[PDB]
Amino acid sequence: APITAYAQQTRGLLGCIITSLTGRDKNQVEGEVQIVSTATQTFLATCINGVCWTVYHGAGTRTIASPKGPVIQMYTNVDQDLVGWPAPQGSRSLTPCTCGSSDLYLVTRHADVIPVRRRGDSRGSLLSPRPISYLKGSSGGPLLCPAGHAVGLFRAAVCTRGVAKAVDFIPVENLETTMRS
Amino acid sequence: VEGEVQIVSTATQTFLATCINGVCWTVYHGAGTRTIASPKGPVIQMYTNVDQDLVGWPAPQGSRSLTPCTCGSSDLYLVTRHADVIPVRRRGDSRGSLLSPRPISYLKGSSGGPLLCPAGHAVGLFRAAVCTRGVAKAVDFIPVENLETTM
């Protein structure tokens, strides 16, 4: 079976805001990737090996709202640009890639999986360049090898004239390293 | 929810259709030049290509289009009318070998279905099964390029 994904919104502006403050979220969680929001921005967070990882330049040092109130980060690595909270009860984790495949697939916030060719330790070329706005909101999303395993987490886009031609990502290795730190 | 593949049927046989690029494609040997039903009446084919065994009407309701493959992968996956996924190794522009040959009945009625790459993008439309002694070993398919060109 090929990589296919879908999305579902679980709450709107107002519920989001109340929950941001309250820090108590009672919604049931399902899925490998969570669509996350702060009062300033929305992005993604991927659950890999029981840990809900996301991009530091988005989550900052914040806590994640949960059924038991705010949950403090398990890992925070300003330099690796990573943060990770214990994966939410009900989520499903992906596992790291063990095949060094250089044919990756970026799963965007809109549940679209677009191919990117690995061209370095933290880069890949979009076989079909897309405008920046489309990639907006996908930070912290996974880059999967053909088998469906986490190779990395989308961090930034390499673009010009407003079109993303490449992507910069946090390799799944920095996660291991960050946990070990 | 919206489906990319529609399960259609005529007076005799039943087969599949796939929406790609806003068009609902299928096999000419299933539909022919026939019109497609709608709550407002039958709507005609926007495309008909007896030669490539290809025909397409404007995508129906409850459907969502599939994206053409851009990665050029040969590790294809066929989707049947029962939603079964069958890994197929691409042997050629219109041919692929099932990784596990299956009895013809298993691929029966699935013509017009999609042939996906490892990213779920459309690579081609299942044209016909190539079976030896009642066993589908490989399959014939219309690449998306023909469709991209046809439209």
């Binding site: 296919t4 994904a5 879908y6 579902q8 549940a111 | 929810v1 919206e2 489906g3 990319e4 593949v5 529609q6 399960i7 259609v8 049927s9 005529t10 007076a11 039943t14 259709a17 299928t26 539909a31 026939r34 019109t35 497609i36 039903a37 039958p42 009407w57 129906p60 409850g62 459907s63 969502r64 599939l66 989707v79 009318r81 939603a83 999609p114 996906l116 779920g120």
Partner: peptide
Amino acid sequence: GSVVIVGRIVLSGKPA
């Protein structure tokens, strides 16, 4: 005759 859609398949398996 006329081609009638007797069902649909969502590839992502979205229940929604």
